[PDB]
Design a protein around this nucleic acid. Structure first.
Lengths: 62, 167, 205, 85
RNA sequence: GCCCGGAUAGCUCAGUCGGUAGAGCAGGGGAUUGAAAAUCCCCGUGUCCUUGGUUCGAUUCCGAGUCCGGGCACCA
RNA sequence: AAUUGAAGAGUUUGAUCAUGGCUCAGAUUGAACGCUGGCGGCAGGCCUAACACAUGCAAGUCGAACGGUAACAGGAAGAAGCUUGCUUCUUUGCUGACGAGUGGCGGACGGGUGAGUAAUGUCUGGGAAACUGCCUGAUGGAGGGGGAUAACUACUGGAAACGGUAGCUAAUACCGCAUAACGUCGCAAGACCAAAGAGGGGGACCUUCGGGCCUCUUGCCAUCGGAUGUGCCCAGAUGGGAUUAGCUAGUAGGUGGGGUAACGGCUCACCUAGGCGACGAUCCCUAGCUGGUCUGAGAGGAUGACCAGCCACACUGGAACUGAGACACGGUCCAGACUCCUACGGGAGGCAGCAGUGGGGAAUAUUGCACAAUGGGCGCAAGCCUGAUGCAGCCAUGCCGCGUGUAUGAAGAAGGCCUUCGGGUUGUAAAGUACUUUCAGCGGGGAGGAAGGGAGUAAAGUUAAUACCUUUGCUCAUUGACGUUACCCGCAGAAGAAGCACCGGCUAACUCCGUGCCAGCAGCCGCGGUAAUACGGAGGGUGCAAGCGUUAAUCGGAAUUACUGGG
């Protein structure tokens, strides 16, 4: 099944297993599950000081 | 059995089985140490006794942990793992590419054996099986290969077409 | 656990005063009350209906400092208990030990009175009680053990809390630093400008 | 399994021999009785009954057979040797 | 572990014989409109993995290590 | 005294009112995921592969049933180092007790899982054709013999597992005879059937001088009882599908033979030709059931994880044995697949017991401690076993509580941010000051969970007897895994302790800047095409708080399946 990739700059390359969560896109026809960005192979977005839980980025502190 | 062996820190007992032999690690199914059984995740320490146990052929010591990097380190056998993995999958995929490649053989250069001749001295080409083992596996990247079949030169008019291209 | 932040700010948002800087100084200018909780706060807001019911729930829990979760508990307990659920609610919130302490005024505020109960400095019937959310039964004689007793702050705090319009549903030796609780407050004697039903209906949603 | 209760197996198994042994006895006498019924030798069929009577009752007492069962055999069988007349 | 092939600017890719790296497709700018489309006008994109040696010439030669992909052993 | 209980909003349109779907607000969870992370208490934790599994442990107990004694501690008795009593080597079951063996009990309990089962199940309520170890009421008996066999010897097969043959010996093992009944069968007369001894004490007396004998507690046999457990039977209820309508020949019933603890096609022979089915049979799919849990005002709707009752399975298929009871989770036998030992002939095994491993997965822990408490097995008891259970570790997984300072404090500081660039805001927040020190970290204290049980002792009961033993009081020594406990006392020091979602409407909360139908957001409406409050950062705000969101899932709103309650 097709899957949306959330946020800025994904890093996935063809293979790489990733966790999948729910939520239709309501924009793309026939697409249904968001790739759990920040989990497993899908590295979180680069630079996300705000709302980082979604997008998998951790504390900006580092 | 009487054979110590250095292993980079952070190493997992699974690496250890691969170190001795890939299949020892491939079909591997758990190992004890010091008379106590431990999970694959436990890192190896100071030259402790090994009490590994094996099985048959199926390998997945990290099929569900390889990329995860959740304890099953050192590129050693895992390198060998992708090998194994590909080997099987690629075999059936040989079959897929098999058919595909054949039609493309008769697509541009026409005829299987003719096109296979041009691939005889090809890219570390190996046996005719490796050919489809490559394309069927996708590790040869096409189109380049296609044009290579029709790498024919002539210019008995195309030389002036190269003039018409300039015109 | 506890908001533990710019306490005067909460009074700015909710409305007027929240007794968070009691006594010595009323919300005297160097408080910037009115409306200006934040930057744009000074500007005119409309506050749609839900917002009103909200602010009431917020203001109230702010006064008692209680967090929403445990506050919800207070609501449910107020529900099963007979009659004016809105009233039983206020009876429960007002009967809080640390709240009973602020009622005896040992703590200048409800907050100071809270750490107070948390320091095991206070007891009831001679039994040291460390629970901030301790609920007080009728006819209790909450005291102040000698080791933590007579510590300047508390007594000056008592003369301070005298400025209020005096609690009336309890008892106290004040000078002897020894609270007591008669019956739970009658709805009539407890602010009474702090609408409550707005909260009952709030959770009714 | 290897757990001192295999003895139970052995012990119980040994009992099987003896138990079945004596059980065989009971049923065979009864057979001759039913066999005696085909014959019509009511007097000696009765004799056969008189032979099983102590044997069946005894086994009932030994616990190899629930008493009520003995009551059954003697009952209906006696009914048969009466009707055989 | 050892031996050998593959990274040619965004995608696909071109030459990769010591030679001064080219396009296909796309992509952006322009005129056009509220922005596009259609129409019309115009171009571009490089460390040839990285490193350093022989170097006018190296990007292919040289070994190193990176990642890709193959081959064989190592059976505690 | 024993429920006081019900919210709507967005979205079709140029605009409306209907109709009406989609979507949101709420509570919920065995949850996972991101981010983050102080403590404690009480809970929960393999939902997928009923997939396979290394190690340990999870079921033994009784010497007061028995032959015995291989160990061990002693005694008694002796070659004897001979400090003539410091103890070396030795024989003997003589006692404390005790491997292996017989035997009684147990192992059918406890504990796990939910595959199967759509009814051989369960729940609810009825019933007659039943059995019931251990416990317990009453009535009686407990007489007299025989043959064995295991262990143990000798030889011997096999690498092992496991036996083979000859001998010897015991008993609460087994068999017989006798002896019977308010027991069985039987119209009755009649016929017929049971078992077993131990351990403590002991005066008189008899002692083939082991003892009989008196007594005592228990054990033993039978019958009628009671309690408990279990099997059975009928009615009603107990999922979906009619794009499943016909189904069945032990099938429906009778007769008789047999069979079970027991009625019965429960099983056979013979005769009848029926029985079930639209109130859904049969067939198909799915599923353990319920008390309950979740939600909901209510009626309902979903589910039945922890806990508790029942049912079914115990590597897959199946059969039976022993016993009161199993058609047996850690029993047997056969088959099968799979693992492992091998000397290739043959053998061994079953974590859905506790922990633990691999694997599957989005995902769920420690091969921890102890018998002290409850309860269980056995033994008269003391006791031993007890992964039941009690506790402990783990993980925010939930519910709950507390803490992360408190009061004060305007130059309304700095720095950050907006500015209509005066200023505003951050914000009494910080600093400072003075304050208290929960719980972390430290030092000393200190319950309860402990009731019994033990030895002595007194009396009472029994009795020929201050005997022995039982029952009941006093006496000291005692009996805690958790556990460097709970809790308290004292210690120094603000010190060791805050995140996450969101701010266009729905819905609490705004601006600046960056980007320009792009990059990105979204649950719905929709935002972004060079001035975005909606994208990314910032400041400020709102929410919530050791949690916050995301997703999944149920119900709710939904009176969109309406019985309450529509058309």
């Amino acid at each position: 099944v097709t899957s949306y990739i959330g946020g800025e700059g994904h890093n996935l390359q063809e293979h790489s297993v990733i966790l999948i969560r729910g939520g239709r896109v309501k924009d793309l026809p026939g697409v249904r599950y968001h790739t759990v960005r920040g989990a497993l192979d899908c590295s979180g977005v680069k630079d996300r000081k705000q709302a980082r839980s979604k997008y998998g980025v951790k504390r900006p502190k580092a | 059995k009487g054979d110590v062996v250095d292993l980079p820190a952070g190493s997992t007992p699974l690496d250890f089985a691969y170190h001795i032999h890939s299949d020892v690690g491939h079909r591997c199914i758990g190992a004890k140490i010091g008379g106590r059984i431990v999970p694959f995740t436990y890192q190896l320490q100071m030259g402790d006794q090994i009490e590994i146990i094996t099985q048959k052929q199926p390998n997945p010591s990290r099929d569900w942990l390889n990329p995860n990097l959740g304890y099953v380190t050192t590129s050693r056998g895992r390198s060998k793992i992708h090998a194994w993995f590909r080997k099987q999958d690629r075999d059936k995929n040989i079959l897929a590419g098999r058919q595909i490649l054949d039609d493309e053989l008769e697509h541009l250069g026409i005829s299987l054996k003719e096109a296979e001749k041009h691939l005889l001295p090809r890219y570390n080409f190996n046996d005719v099986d490796e050919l489809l083992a490559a394309i069927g596996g996708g590790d040869i990247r096409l189109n380049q290969m296609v044009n290579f079949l029709q790498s024919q030169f002539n210019k008995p008019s195309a030389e002036e077409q190269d003039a018409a291209a300039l015109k | 656990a506890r908001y533990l932040g710019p306490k005067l700010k909460l009074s700015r948002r909710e409305g007027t005063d929240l007794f968070l800087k009691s006594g010595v100084r009323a919300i005297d200018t160097k408080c910037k009350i009115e409306q200006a909780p934040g930057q744009h706060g000074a500007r005119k807001p409309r506050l749609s209906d839900y917002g009103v019911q909200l602010r009431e729930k917020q203001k109230v829990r702010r006064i008692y400092g209680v967090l929403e979760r445990q506050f919800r508990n207070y609501y449910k307990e107020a529900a099963r208990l007979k009659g004016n659920t809105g009233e039983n609610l206020l009876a429960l919130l007002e009967g809080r030990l640390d709240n009973v302490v602020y009622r005896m005024g040992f703590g200048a505020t409800r907050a100071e009175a809270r750490q107070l109960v948390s320091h095991k400095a206070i007891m009831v019937n001679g039994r040291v009680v460390n629970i901030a959310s301790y609920q007080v039964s009728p006819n209790d004689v909450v005291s102040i053990r000698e080791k933590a007793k007579k510590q300047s702050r508390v007594k000056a705090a008592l003369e301070l809390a005298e400025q209020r319009e005096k609690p009336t549903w309890l008892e106290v030796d004040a000078g002897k630093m020894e609270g007591t609780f008669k019956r739970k407050p009658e709805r009539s004697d407890l602010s009474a400008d702090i609408n409550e039903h707005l909260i009952v209906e709030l959770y009714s949603k | 399994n290897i757990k001192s209760a295999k003895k139970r197996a052995i012990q119980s198994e040994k009992a099987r021999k003896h138990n079945a042994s004596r059980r065989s006895m009971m049923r065979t006498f009864i057979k001759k009785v039913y066999a005696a019924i085909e014959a019509g030798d009511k007097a000696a069929a009765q004799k056969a009954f008189n032979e099983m009577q102590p044997i069946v009752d005894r086994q009932a007492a030994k616990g190899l057979i629930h008493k009520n069962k003995a009551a059954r055999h003697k009952a209906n069988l006696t009914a048969q040797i009466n009707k055989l007349a």
